[PDB]
Each structure stands twice: as structure tokens, then as C-alpha cells.
Design an enzyme around this catalytic site. Sequence first.
Site, PDB file in Angstrom:
ATOM      1  N   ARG B  36       0.839  -1.181   0.000  1.00 14.03           N
ATOM      2  CA  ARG B  36       0.000   0.000   0.000  1.00 14.03           C
ATOM      3  C   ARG B  36       0.885   1.244   0.000  1.00 14.03           C
ATOM      4  O   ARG B  36       2.063   1.173   0.363  1.00 14.03           O
ATOM      5  CB  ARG B  36      -0.879  -0.023   1.242  1.00 14.03           C
ATOM      6  CG  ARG B  36      -2.000   0.968   1.225  1.00 14.03           C
ATOM      7  CD  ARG B  36      -3.116   0.544   0.291  1.00 14.03           C
ATOM      8  NE  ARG B  36      -3.738   1.737  -0.265  1.00 14.03           N
ATOM      9  CZ  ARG B  36      -4.330   2.680   0.457  1.00 14.03           C
ATOM     10  NH1 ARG B  36      -4.431   2.548   1.775  1.00 14.03           N
ATOM     11  NH2 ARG B  36      -4.847   3.741  -0.140  1.00 14.03           N
ATOM     12  N   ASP B  69      -4.617  -1.678   9.816  1.00 15.90           N
ATOM     13  CA  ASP B  69      -3.623  -0.873   9.085  1.00 15.90           C
ATOM     14  C   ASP B  69      -2.362  -0.718   9.908  1.00 15.90           C
ATOM     15  O   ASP B  69      -1.263  -1.018   9.458  1.00 15.90           O
ATOM     16  CB  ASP B  69      -4.118   0.552   8.796  1.00 15.90           C
ATOM     17  CG  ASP B  69      -5.203   0.607   7.754  1.00 15.90           C
ATOM     18  OD1 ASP B  69      -5.207  -0.262   6.859  1.00 15.90           O
ATOM     19  OD2 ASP B  69      -6.037   1.540   7.824  1.00 15.90           O
ATOM     20  N   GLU B 195      -2.700  16.504   6.453  1.00  5.95           N
ATOM     21  CA  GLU B 195      -2.375  15.087   6.425  1.00  5.95           C
ATOM     22  C   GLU B 195      -1.701  14.678   5.120  1.00  5.95           C
ATOM     23  O   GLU B 195      -1.946  15.265   4.061  1.00  5.95           O
ATOM     24  CB  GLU B 195      -3.647  14.250   6.573  1.00  5.95           C
ATOM     25  CG  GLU B 195      -4.452  14.493   7.837  1.00  5.95           C
ATOM     26  CD  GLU B 195      -4.275  13.399   8.876  1.00  5.95           C
ATOM     27  OE1 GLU B 195      -5.069  13.387   9.842  1.00  5.95           O
ATOM     28  OE2 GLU B 195      -3.349  12.562   8.735  1.00  5.95           O
ATOM     29  N   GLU B 196      -0.846  13.663   5.215  1.00  9.61           N
ATOM     30  CA  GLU B 196      -0.171  13.096   4.061  1.00  9.61           C
ATOM     31  C   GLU B 196       0.276  14.129   3.027  1.00  9.61           C
ATOM     32  O   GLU B 196      -0.173  14.093   1.879  1.00  9.61           O
ATOM     33  CB  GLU B 196      -1.123  12.082   3.416  1.00  9.61           C
ATOM     34  CG  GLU B 196      -1.931  11.301   4.448  1.00  9.61           C
ATOM     35  CD  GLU B 196      -2.861  10.271   3.843  1.00  9.61           C
ATOM     36  OE1 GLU B 196      -3.769  10.642   3.073  1.00  9.61           O
ATOM     37  OE2 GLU B 196      -2.685   9.079   4.148  1.00  9.61           O
ATOM     38  N   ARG B 211      -3.541  17.144   2.502  1.00  7.39           N
ATOM     39  CA  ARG B 211      -4.913  16.648   2.557  1.00  7.39           C
ATOM     40  C   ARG B 211      -5.673  17.183   3.759  1.00  7.39           C
ATOM     41  O   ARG B 211      -5.155  17.213   4.869  1.00  7.39           O
ATOM     42  CB  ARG B 211      -4.906  15.113   2.612  1.00  7.39           C
ATOM     43  CG  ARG B 211      -6.206  14.451   3.085  1.00  7.39           C
ATOM     44  CD  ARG B 211      -6.057  12.925   3.127  1.00  7.39           C
ATOM     45  NE  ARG B 211      -7.255  12.254   3.637  1.00  7.39           N
ATOM     46  CZ  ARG B 211      -7.389  10.933   3.767  1.00  7.39           C
ATOM     47  NH1 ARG B 211      -6.397  10.123   3.414  1.00  7.39           N
ATOM     48  NH2 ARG B 211      -8.519  10.414   4.243  1.00  7.39           N
ATOM     49  N   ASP B 212      -6.910  17.602   3.529  1.00  8.17           N
ATOM     50  CA  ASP B 212      -7.747  18.106   4.605  1.00  8.17           C
ATOM     51  C   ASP B 212      -8.821  17.035   4.837  1.00  8.17           C
ATOM     52  O   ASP B 212      -9.715  16.819   4.003  1.00  8.17           O
ATOM     53  CB  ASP B 212      -8.362  19.454   4.203  1.00  8.17           C
ATOM     54  CG  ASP B 212      -9.101  20.132   5.348  1.00  8.17           C
ATOM     55  OD1 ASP B 212      -9.134  21.376   5.379  1.00  8.17           O
ATOM     56  OD2 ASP B 212      -9.660  19.422   6.207  1.00  8.17           O
ATOM     57  N   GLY B 216     -12.011  20.142   4.360  1.00 11.93           N
ATOM     58  CA  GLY B 216     -11.435  20.645   3.125  1.00 11.93           C
ATOM     59  C   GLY B 216     -11.533  19.860   1.831  1.00 11.93           C
ATOM     60  O   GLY B 216     -11.115  18.700   1.744  1.00 11.93           O
ATOM     61  N   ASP B 242      -9.524  17.714  -3.791  1.00 13.58           N
ATOM     62  CA  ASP B 242      -9.570  16.610  -2.833  1.00 13.58           C
ATOM     63  C   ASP B 242     -10.709  15.648  -3.213  1.00 13.58           C
ATOM     64  O   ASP B 242     -11.570  15.985  -4.022  1.00 13.58           O
ATOM     65  CB  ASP B 242      -9.754  17.164  -1.414  1.00 13.58           C
ATOM     66  CG  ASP B 242      -9.180  16.246  -0.344  1.00 13.58           C
ATOM     67  OD1 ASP B 242      -9.058  16.690   0.823  1.00 13.58           O
ATOM     68  OD2 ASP B 242      -8.854  15.082  -0.665  1.00 13.58           O
ATOM     69  N   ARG B 288     -12.613   6.715  -5.539  1.00 12.54           N
ATOM     70  CA  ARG B 288     -11.206   6.834  -5.847  1.00 12.54           C
ATOM     71  C   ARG B 288     -10.996   6.056  -7.134  1.00 12.54           C
ATOM     72  O   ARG B 288     -10.210   5.106  -7.197  1.00 12.54           O
ATOM     73  CB  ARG B 288     -10.360   6.278  -4.698  1.00 12.54           C
ATOM     74  CG  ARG B 288     -10.387   7.173  -3.462  1.00 12.54           C
ATOM     75  CD  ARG B 288      -9.463   6.682  -2.359  1.00 12.54           C
ATOM     76  NE  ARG B 288      -9.579   7.517  -1.163  1.00 12.54           N
ATOM     77  CZ  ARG B 288      -8.887   7.329  -0.042  1.00 12.54           C
ATOM     78  NH1 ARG B 288      -8.018   6.332   0.049  1.00 12.54           N
ATOM     79  NH2 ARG B 288      -9.064   8.141   0.988  1.00 12.54           N
ATOM     80  N   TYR B 322      -4.210   6.896  -3.808  1.00 12.49           N
ATOM     81  CA  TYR B 322      -3.190   7.850  -3.370  1.00 12.49           C
ATOM     82  C   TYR B 322      -2.321   8.361  -4.517  1.00 12.49           C
ATOM     83  O   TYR B 322      -2.258   7.755  -5.576  1.00 12.49           O
ATOM     84  CB  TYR B 322      -2.299   7.204  -2.304  1.00 12.49           C
ATOM     85  CG  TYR B 322      -2.812   7.343  -0.888  1.00 12.49           C
ATOM     86  CD1 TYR B 322      -4.180   7.383  -0.624  1.00 12.49           C
ATOM     87  CD2 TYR B 322      -1.929   7.433   0.187  1.00 12.49           C
ATOM     88  CE1 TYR B 322      -4.659   7.512   0.664  1.00 12.49           C
ATOM     89  CE2 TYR B 322      -2.397   7.566   1.487  1.00 12.49           C
ATOM     90  CZ  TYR B 322      -3.770   7.607   1.719  1.00 12.49           C
ATOM     91  OH  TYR B 322      -4.259   7.767   3.006  1.00 12.49           O
TER      92      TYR B 322
END
Lengths: 387, 387, 387, 387
Positions: B36, B69, B195-196, B211-212, B216, B242, B288, B322
Amino acid sequence: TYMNNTEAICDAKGFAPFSKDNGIRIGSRGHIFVIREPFVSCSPIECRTFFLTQGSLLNDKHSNGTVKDRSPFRTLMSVEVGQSPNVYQARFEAVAWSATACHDGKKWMTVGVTGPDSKAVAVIHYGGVPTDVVNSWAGDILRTQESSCTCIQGDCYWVMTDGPANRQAQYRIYKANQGRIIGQTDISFNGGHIEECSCYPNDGKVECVCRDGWTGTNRPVLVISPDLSYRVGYLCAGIPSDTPRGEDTQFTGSCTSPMGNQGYGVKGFGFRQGTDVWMGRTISRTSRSGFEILRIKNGWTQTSKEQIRKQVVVDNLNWSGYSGSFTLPVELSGKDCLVPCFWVEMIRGKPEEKTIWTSSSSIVMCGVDYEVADWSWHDGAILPFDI
Amino acid sequence: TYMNNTEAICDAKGFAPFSKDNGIRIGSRGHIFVIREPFVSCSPIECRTFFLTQGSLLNDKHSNGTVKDRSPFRTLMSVEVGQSPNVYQARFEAVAWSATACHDGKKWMTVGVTGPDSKAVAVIHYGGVPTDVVNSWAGDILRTQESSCTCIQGDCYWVMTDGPANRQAQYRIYKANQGRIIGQTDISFNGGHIEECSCYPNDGKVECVCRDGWTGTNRPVLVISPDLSYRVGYLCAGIPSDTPRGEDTQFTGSCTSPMGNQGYGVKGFGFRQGTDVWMGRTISRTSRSGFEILRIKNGWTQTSKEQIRKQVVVDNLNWSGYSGSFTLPVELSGKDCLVPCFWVEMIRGKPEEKTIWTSSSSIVMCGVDYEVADWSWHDGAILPFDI
Amino acid sequence: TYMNNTEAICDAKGFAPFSKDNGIRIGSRGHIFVIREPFVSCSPIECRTFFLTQGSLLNDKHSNGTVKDRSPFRTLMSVEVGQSPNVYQARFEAVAWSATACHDGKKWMTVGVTGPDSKAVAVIHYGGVPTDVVNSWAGDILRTQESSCTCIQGDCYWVMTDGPANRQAQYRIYKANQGRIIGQTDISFNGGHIEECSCYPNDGKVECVCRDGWTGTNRPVLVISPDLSYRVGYLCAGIPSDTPRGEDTQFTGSCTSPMGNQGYGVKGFGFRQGTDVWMGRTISRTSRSGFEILRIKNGWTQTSKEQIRKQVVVDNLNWSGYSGSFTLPVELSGKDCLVPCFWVEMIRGKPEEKTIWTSSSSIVMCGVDYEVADWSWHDGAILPFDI
Amino acid sequence: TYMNNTEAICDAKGFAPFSKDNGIRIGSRGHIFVIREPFVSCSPIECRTFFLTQGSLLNDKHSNGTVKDRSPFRTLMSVEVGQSPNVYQARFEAVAWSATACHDGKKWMTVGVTGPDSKAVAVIHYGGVPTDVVNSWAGDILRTQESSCTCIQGDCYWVMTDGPANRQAQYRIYKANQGRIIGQTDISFNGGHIEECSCYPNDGKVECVCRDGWTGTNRPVLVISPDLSYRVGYLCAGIPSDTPRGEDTQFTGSCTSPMGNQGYGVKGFGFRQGTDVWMGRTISRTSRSGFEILRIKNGWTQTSKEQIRKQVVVDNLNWSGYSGSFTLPVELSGKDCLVPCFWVEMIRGKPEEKTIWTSSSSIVMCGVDYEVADWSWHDGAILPFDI
Ligand SMILES: CCC(CC)O[C@@H]1C=C(C(=O)O)C[C@H](N)[C@H]1NC(C)=O
Ligand SMILES: CCC(CC)O[C@@H]1C=C(C(=O)O)C[C@H](N)[C@H]1NC(C)=O
Ligand SMILES: CCC(CC)O[C@@H]1C=C(C(=O)O)C[C@H](N)[C@H]1NC(C)=O
Ligand SMILES: CCC(CC)O[C@@H]1C=C(C(=O)O)C[C@H](N)[C@H]1NC(C)=O
């Protein structure tokens, strides 16, 4: 530093076995990439075998073959010549369903073409990283050599075709240094057709023997001078080397034009020896079964039919296929000339066989100043597979 | 020596395919790590693909996915870009269920976070050996980039988040030289969420597009000056990048605040081009599925909605996921600027598919001063697997 | 050049996860060596994980385990720390059913013992080639460390035992330079027993914490001066670290003698911190289930029971096993002291589980000047296997 | 630079285990090449194990064995000594069904013979690329050593046989520098027979102990001076070392002629120690079961029957097979003499066993100035296999 490669091709009397991967046999139990067009190119340290993969392994459902040639999974990878195209010793080169690669002496330059047929893109890698790009210039399957490109004193050259597989198409010669394009030319060849050229350096010029998929049984030839000025035509020899083809007995060779109403073709090679020429060809005049190489006296510059040597490398009861040319760097051979070497791809499975997949092995042969006995170094796999 | 990386990002018109591992297809028969978040980072010699593994292989009971995870088996490993994440060509980096890595020009610096959610620990490796440590500072899942960190003139920078996935959280910027921490900052961003982050060097400053996961739809952006002084906010552009998100038609861009009541998110990237901006985003506004990249004129500094370029890399009938950013070292590209490149992860199996496992492939794309045709380089695997 | 290793052990407050191979889980589908005693040693470039193999792979009939420990198939091999002991990334070290290895800074020195129990032979390899030999000197299973040996300024040291597992046995210290033996000593320790020592360099002397398989619940300790002069005894601490063992509550520590009528044992380690000591031990006082490490104030030189730190690395609901010590070369850590690191082996399958085989994974931990949260990085495999 | 190798063979009292691949056991689940004749040769950096493959893997239909020895799939490959002949760590050497290899200190020189029996061709590789060729000179299965060749001060030497396996045959000594042939000789030996010589350097001359497949129970011996002048005959010792053979009790040794009416044979070796000699031989006098090595006082130059040492390496209840000689480069051993080492091949499967395939493992042993205890390091595989 850069590989000079300005020497003349060595005059050889026969060729000796360099390697054999036995990929398909191994692939019965091993994790071997279902591949195709396994050409060989050498760096001043080692010779590697490049090949195209469909992202699948032999004996796996993903090898179903129904996947199109120019699919988005097609990637170009490589291994040290003689090694099977296995997943664990492979190196990623570029994303491609048509490629070419050569080493200028410092870094490796690969060229992978991928994308839609109508707007394919060719990405030039150098050092294992994209440096330049060539977009389809005619909107019809942008493609290239399928065998080693050529680097002389730092600059590397290769030939591409954009257009239909039957009728006329547009051809060009690209030149590049350190991964970036520094020039190019359009090849005027009306009535003529060019595909999958097998090039090699010889006397500071790039000599290529290609494929005529339009109306050529004899193979087109194009000497490229370092300044992109060039010369195009056909192998003079009064003997047909493309497949399919008619009998030699009905072939009047031609230095400037295609002959035989045959239209299809297959990738082959040829090495000029002074004025003579070593030409390769499937033994069958129709099927891609069998491989041999004849030396025709004065055949590079005359409709000669005078055969001086013959050596079979794959008997006619075995499947053959594509074949390309390359040269041994002088830094590996030690000679004062460039040793001429080639590879024979051996297609197994569909279409000629009853299996859901399709792949191929290969044997590499090199120059040598001796006469080598006939024999058959065929694939050897046992089809069908577990499937 | 150290990689300067003080140059400006190269102005590109489109991107060309760098590589494609085809891990999952290969994984049908090969021994591929169920992985991943396969981000890419480059050293002055090669670009490698980093990924997270669950200690299990595809087509094995251990891939059951029911494993959390942030499990204790999660380790960070890598391979040369384009190579599948196979067991035999992989390198162990660090124990992690969230990581980041970058090469300063001499050695490789990886950062793996592992441990309990309430007291996770981030171990900094350098040279393939732990050198420093960052303990959770807020007791709530200490995490980081999931993509390349950034090294400018020897010092490497990266961003971490400790706190909830919904509401506010605490963010910080760490700086380190030769594996040891030499400074840090708290990012004030009340009402904002980070994030990320996908960072890259540009004009001696570290630009990140993140990333929000709170409120966001537009992505937060944070320019980091070498002295940990910084600037935070959002991608100005009047277009949401996003996922999930609403229509562009209902989005009034905002340079300082989040917009769209959407709360969830997905890791993306963005590259500033002068004042313009290349932003990436899944094609679906909810799933996605699909990947594309738009160039918005002045979009880096204006609520611009003026699209100047669009190029799809994964059509909307295929699973995406991603995506991160990185740059080609000038020592590999040869350019005088830093070529901008990214990767798109392609999630297969659960949740959207009916298989007991979950993994992903990836395709790498790079700068290029040409316009590249739209196409889809999707995963290609055939689910379900033998299981 | 040679690694000095004359520095003092770094004073650490806790340890951080270095790596985790996840061999057994991977071994469900991969081609992983059914192994045992996976110790770690480092060179001035990388740390490798050494292990013993029975010439068989996980999930194969050959893993039947009924094969004796000291069988003629037992070979010593290695991989870069964190990598599973897979067949394709492994390196052959020596033929052995008991080994040790260390890098002096130039080449690798391994020591493998093999042969009949009554006349076993220990072959010293250096540079990947046998250089010297040590024959059984007491005709009773000649054996050694099962963990990293020690090299200080070019000369490498290690400890061996020849004699019974219960009653007295004979112990010796060997010293060698560039693969050849340059000296040795007999260790006088009547009433005492020594096995599988975990050594590390500290202040130009070789400190080892070993195993008492006779009557010791506390572990024997032996500081070795470069001239083979030495000091032997037991870890002073008023807390038992061997397994099996009794309660700490009933243990009166002893610096010179064994205590607890327990006779069996298990390989452990310990790191002196000034006068304090980091001692490791299975959590269960009887089963090899669980792993933890306590820091006892003044415990290296006093019957101290004053615990200042505790950190679990494998909870007590998970299988543990052997554990050894080693140090990070200063050329990798960058510190001015030698960072202390250890490994915990995790035994799965017989005897505690119902499978025909037996193997083990491992997690590596290192120094660190921070306090690391408790957690469990256990094996994770799912037994039984396909078998 | 070049390896001098002008030193005398080291006087050893016994041999110690160097390595053991356990290929066949591993091959039960791993992807191991079904191989044969796994000889060992060393470079000034590492010792590698060379072997012949039939392009197939163990436990695969392609291992059917019905494939002829001298088939077109037979290729020569290698791995670092002790490593199994697995597909993923193997290196392609040359196409061959009979080979030899040696390192002169700079590059590797391999010699692979392939082609039709009546006109076989031997290709000399150097640097991983063919340089010269030797064509069959008698039209009857051109073959060679099956073990390490010899390089002294840059020039490498090896012996070949062209002719029948029973009656007389023609033998020759080839000499080469940097892959190219620089001289050769015909060996006059009427009534004598030579095959699969095990050579090693000793006092600037190439000493070989070979096989007599005509009428020899004692082994022929041939000291080769750097100028191709030479000396041929038989191991003097009054003890038969070939297999099959009669009792020692009925053997009157002979320095110049073969003895025992036995005609068949098996590849063995022998090391001269001053005037003494270490000779190897299967334990069974008829089956290739068991392996031992005896030191005969003055046996190199006298019909001596005076045994001074005996050491079994494979008991007589286990299958043995081929065995060859080589030497440790002084650059690896560190000694001032050339350490003598050998390998024992262990044949499993047909003909002696009921399986459709046939392969072999091996153990490597080296010089050593100590006396090593008897023991058996046999194959260990469990036949039959899944098939
Ligand atoms: C587009 C025509 C071109 C030249 C004949 O076709 C080739 C023929 C092939 C063939 O005859 O087997 C296989 C090649 N993969 C293909 N090239 C591409 C790009 O698809
Ligand atoms: C803790 C929240 C964090 C940011 C949204 O979650 C991520 C989202 C993920 C996702 O949306 O797929 C996968 C990442 N593995 C996960 N990170 C961690 C550490 O578990
Ligand atoms: C001979 C006694 C010795 C020390 C207790 O036994 C060890 C204990 C072991 C154990 O307790 O698991 C495994 C080791 N493989 C073994 N060493 C040898 C050489 O067999
Ligand atoms: C041609 C006779 C020759 C010497 C006895 O046979 C060898 C004997 C062999 C054997 O006795 O097992 C195996 C070798 N593969 C073979 N060599 C070749 C080239 O086939």
C-alpha cells in the site's frame, strides 16, 4: 567515457553460441515474464537482453494473450544476456509496446513507446530516468526498432516509423546525446517501406537492415552518416531474406526496389562484410519456423546469388521468429574491429500452437573467425502448459 | 556529497510515463508483497519505490486484510522504481504503518512510525540504521507524509500530524541532518487540517500540497523556508482537488480557508509553476476511481478557474487512489531545474471489489516540456484471485 | 581499515524498532528458509541477520523437523537485517549447527561448527573462505555463541563450550586476527556453567552475558580483556533473567554464584550502563512466551532490585525465544559511543504448536536516548500451515 | 592484476567443510536448476560453483531426464559457492554440455562445448563474452574437464578429449591469455586414456589427475609445464582410485600404465603433497556411493600402499559421484602456499533411484593443517518428489 564504435565490422566465417535463456522451459515452474522481442544490446561491461512484458507470468491466467500487443501493461525490462526474463533478476527500463536501447559507454539509453495508437508517445530514458520525448508525428502507431540502437562517439541513433503497416508510412532517423534529442531526419522512400530495423555500427556510419511490410521480400537497407545525411534502398543480393517470401529461384535481386508481391514480413538482420553480406532468414519461406544465415559474395552491392557459406542455428522443424543485430563493444571483445552478433527469438504458443498464451526464448550468436557446424538450439518447451 | 536542490521546479506542459510495476497482475503467480502507499523518492543514482507491507504475499491466506492498518507487521520496504514490490528484490527500510524517505545525496534517510496509536514512535533511519527518534506528542496516531520528504543542501525536512482524523489536530515540521533532528516547528492552523503532505523542493523552500480530512475539498498548502519559518493555507485555485468533493461549478476557491462541507479526503499532490499550478485529482468526485492532472493559470495564487491543460493518466472506469510528488535529482535529469514527477497508486480488491485482500499498483510520471496524450495506464489485474 | 570499537556502550533510556523480517508469514507463500537462531552482526556498511538453516523451506515436506538439530544439512547463512531468510537473497556463510560472526571492518569472519558430536569441528571463515580450524577439545558437542562475536582494533573474540549441557563443561575464549587464531584461554568456573554468550564491546573489553544450563537462574557474565585475561561470574542484580526461573520475590541476587535450583535455560543478553544494567528476559517465568527488558539501577555491580525502566517488546500472549546482543558500528550510527542493540527470536510451530515444522522470526531493537512505549511486535504467522 | 599461482600446494593433514548448497532438498519447494557436475573455481574475490543445467527446474515436468546429456538446452551457469543452483541468483556463463572455468585474477574465463557430437564447438568466453573457438578435431564428442581450469601468471590452461569413450582417443592441452588461444599440444598416450581432468597449480606447473574410461583403475596424471611441454602417466600409488575398481589387495600400482581390467570410470581428483598424495575415491568399489580421501606416503612417485590418513566425507550408505579439484587463491586464504580444495557431487534420482529426474548436490572441502574427523555430509533429499 564514450564508446568510440568507429571501427569496421569484423569479417567472420561463422558464428558461435553466446547464450540461451531457456526461459519458457524454466517458466514451466519458475516465475518467468511472458515476453516478446528479446533483443540484445551491450555496454562496455556487459551485454543485456531486453524484452517486452505484458505484466504477466508464464503459467498464470494473466498470460491469456487476448490482451492487445499495444496494451497499457506493456513495459520494457532487461536482464544479463542468457538469463531468463524472470521477475527476480529483471530491471525496469521503460513503459513500452515497442522499444530500443543502447549504451554510449557511460549510461544506458532506452526508448519506450507507449500510449494510444493515434497519439503514442516515445519516452527517452537515460541513466534510468526519462530525459526527452518524441510524440507520434503521423497519428498511426508510433513504433521503433525492437533491437539495439547505435551509439558512435557519444551520440546514439535509432529509426522510427509512424504510419500504416501496408501502404506507405513515414520514417525518420533520430539522433541523441546523453538522453536528449539533438537532430532528426525524414527518410524519403516512396514505394518503399521500413520497419523494425536491425542496426549496427560500421566504419563510423550506422548500417541497418530492416523489414518491408508493404511489398518487400528483399530487405530495405539504410546507411546513416553521423550528420543524419543517409542512404536508403534494399539488400542487393539476388536472394530473398524476408518472411514470407518466394523461392530464391524466382527472385531477381534489386538494390533500389522491393521485389516479390509478398506484403507481410518479419524482423531480420544482415551484416555487411566488405562487399559481401551475412543475411539471416527463417528456413521456411512461409512460416516463422527455422533460422539460418547465408553469406553472399558481393551481395551487399550486387544482385549476387553466390552463396559462400550457410549455417543453420534452428532446424526447420522448430519455431523461429524475430531476429536482430548488435555488436560486441571492443572493450569486451578485445578485437580491433567490432564483432558482429545477433539473436534469434523463438515463438511458442499461439498462433501456431494450442495454448492460451504466447511467448518466446532466444539464442545469441557472435562473430568468430572460424566456421561453426550446423545445429539447432531451439526453445525446447513442452506445450501445452498447466495453462 | 549533498544534493543542492535549490533550483526552481521545471515548467512542464505535460507528463510522460516513467514506469509501471504491474505488481498485482504479476502477484497472481509471483511472490509479490501485498502492499500500500507506494511512494517514489530518488537518490543521485536511482529512483526507488517505497511501499508498506503487511508481512504477507498476494494469493496467500495471510493477505486476509482483516489485519489492522497500524498492525505490528507493517514494515517499510523499497525497490528500484518500476519493479514490483517482490520479496526477492526488496530492501528493508524501517518498521512502519506510516513512513517517508528521501536521499540527501550521500545516504538514504527513512522515517518509519510504528507502535501503539496512543504512544506511537517514529524512528529515523540513515544509512540503513536508526539514528534518532520522535515520540507521539499528542497520543493520537502519530503519522506522516506517505511520500518523499525533502532534502535541500544536506538538511532534510518532513511534516507530521498527531491528533484526530476529523476535528483539529496538531501538525509539526521536522528538520534533520545526517539522520539526527536539528530543529522543529508547530504549525498554527486553527480550523485547518493537514495530512499526508506531498512535498517537493522549489526555490530553496519546501512546497507541500496536503490533505484536509476535516472540512477541506481544496487542499492545504505549506511553503517551508529552510529556517522552519513557514507559510500555510490552501491551494488558491477555484477548483476542488480533494476526494470526495463537490462540483467545480459550485466551488469558490479560497487561498486561506477550506471549502465544501466534505470532510473526508485522499492523498494528492500539486506542483507550482510560477504562479500557475498543476493539481492532481481522482476523476470521480466521490470514488477513488480515475486520475487526471489539470494546469490552472495563476491557480497557485488566485481563485483562478482558468484551465490551460488536462491530461488523464487513468480513465474513470478504473480504480485510482493515493498520489504523491517528488523531483528528479538534477544529477539524473541533467536539467538546470528540478523536473516535477508524481505517482498514482491503484487500489484493487476490498473495499470496492469482492476479494479477501487489498493492495495497489502504480505508475510514475515526470515533467517533460511536451504535451502528452491522454490515456489510461490502469492496474489491469483480474479479480478475484485464487484467494 | 579496522573498526576501533574501543568506545563505551551508549547510555540508552529505551530501544526503538530497527527491523522485522516477517519471515514465517511470508514463508506461507514465499520460499523462506526454515531457520533458527537469527542473530544480528554489523559491518561498517550494513547490519546482516545470520541464521541457521536445515536445508529446507517452509511449507515443504523437508521441514518435518524430525531432523536432528546437529544434522549434516545445517548451514549458516545471512541476509541484510530485516529481510526474511529467503533462498534468493541469502548468502552462504559456513556449514554449521552452531555459529557466530563479526566484521572487523575489512572482511567478514564467520565461525561454523559442524561434524559429529564427539569430534565436532569449527571452521573459521574470513572473506568468504575458510582460514583456520578448532577441533572439539572435550568430545562433547563443541558449540558457540549463536550471536555476534566481537572485534576490537582488528582482533576478534568469541567464546565456546565443549562438554555436557547439565553438569560442568569446559569453556574457552578464542581470539583471532584476519581469520587465523592468535591465542586462547580456558575459563575456570567450577560450579558455574556457560553457554550461548551474548557479547558486545565496551571500553576496550569484551563483555558477555551468557546462559547457565546447569543450576543458574541468574546469568553468568564474563569481561574479556584484550590479552585473554578475563573475569567471570554472574549478573549481580537481585532479579533472575534466565528462563525458566522462579519469582524475583524469591531471588536473592548473587555476583559470584548461580541461584535458583532451575537447571535449564535460554539464550539472553544484557548491557552494562555504567554500573546499571539492561537485562532482557522472557515474560513468562517458565515458557518462552513474551519478551521484555528491564534497567536495574546499579544491577551490574550490586544485588540491586531497583528497577528504573521496563519496556515490553513482545506481549506475554506471544511466543518469544532466543535473544542476542550486538552494537552499531560508530561508522553507521555516527555517535561517539557504541549504540547497544539486540534481537528477539520468535519461535513458532513445534513444540508449543501443532505443526510438523519449527522456525522463528525476529525483531531488532537499538539504543536510543528516549523512552519507547511498550508494545508487541510478535511473529504474526497463522498456524498450522498447508504443512 | 593477474594471480601468480606459482606457489606450491599447501601440505594439509585433513580437510574442513567449506560449504553445502542443499540444492535438491531446497529444490523440493524452491526453483532450483536440475543440474549436474557442480565444479568450483575461485577468483581473487570469491569462489563460485559452476554447474550444468538442462534448462529445467526440479519438480517440473521438464526434468523428465529422458533429455539427452548433450542436448541443445544444456547451458553452463554459476553461483557463489554454497548457494543452491537457483534460477534467481544464477549467472549465465556459456552454452555447454561439458565445460570448465577459471579466473586469471582480472576477468573470468569459461569454456563451454556444445553442438553436434560429430562437430561440436567449444566457445571460450572471457569477461562474459565469447572471444575464441575450438572446433571438434576428431569428430567424436569434443569434451573437457568438468572442473576448474588453471591460470598461472595470466595464462590459463585446460585439457580436452576428442574421440571414443572406450578405445584410444585424442587428447590435447590448450593454453590461453585473456580469452584468446596462444598455443596447444597433442598428448601422446597410446594405450592410455584421459577424461575429465581435475587440475590445480603446483610449483608453476599444472598438475592434473584424470579419468581412464578405457582400461584404467588407477588414474592418469599429467604435469604441464608453462611451455606446453608435459609429462603424462598414472598415479603411482599401489591403490586404485577410479570407480568401478577391484580391491586394493589385488592392485599392484603402476606409474606408467593402467591396471585392472575395469574399463568404465568416474571423475576424481588427487593432490600431490611433496612425494605423498591425497587421492579421493568413492567408498563403494562399484557404485558411486560414498566418498573418502586417503593420503598415501610417497604415493605420488612410488607404488606405495602406505596409507597415513583417511577421512570420510560421505558415508557408504549415501550416493556420491563426480569430484574435482581447485585451489584457494592466496588473495583469499592469506597463506604463502596454495590451499588445496575439492568438491564432491552427490547424485540423486535415476539411475539408482525411482524418480523421473536426475540431479546432484555438493559439499566443498579445503586444505587445513589439522586432522578432521570422519562424517557424512550427504545430500539429504527425500525421494521420490512430487515428480
Ligand atoms: C504496427 C505494425 C508493426 C510492424 C509490422 O507491427 C508489429 C508486428 C509484430 C509481429 O509481426 O509479430 C509484433 C509487434 N509487437 C508489432 N508492433 C507493434 C507496435 O504493435
Ligand atoms: C489516522 C488518520 C489517517 C489520515 C486520514 O489515516 C490514513 C488514511 C488511509 C486511507 O484513507 O486509505 C490509509 C492510511 N494507512 C491511514 N494512516 C494511518 C496511520 O493509519
Ligand atoms: C548442547 C547443549 C546446547 C546448550 C544448552 O543446546 C542448544 C539449545 C537449544 C535450545 O534450547 O533451543 C538449541 C541449540 N541448537 C542447541 N545447540 C546445539 C549445538 O545443539
Ligand atoms: C563421451 C564420454 C564422456 C567421458 C566418459 O562421458 C561423460 C560421462 C558422464 C557420466 O559418467 O556420468 C556424464 C558427462 N556428461 C559425459 N560427458 C559428455 C560430454 O556427455
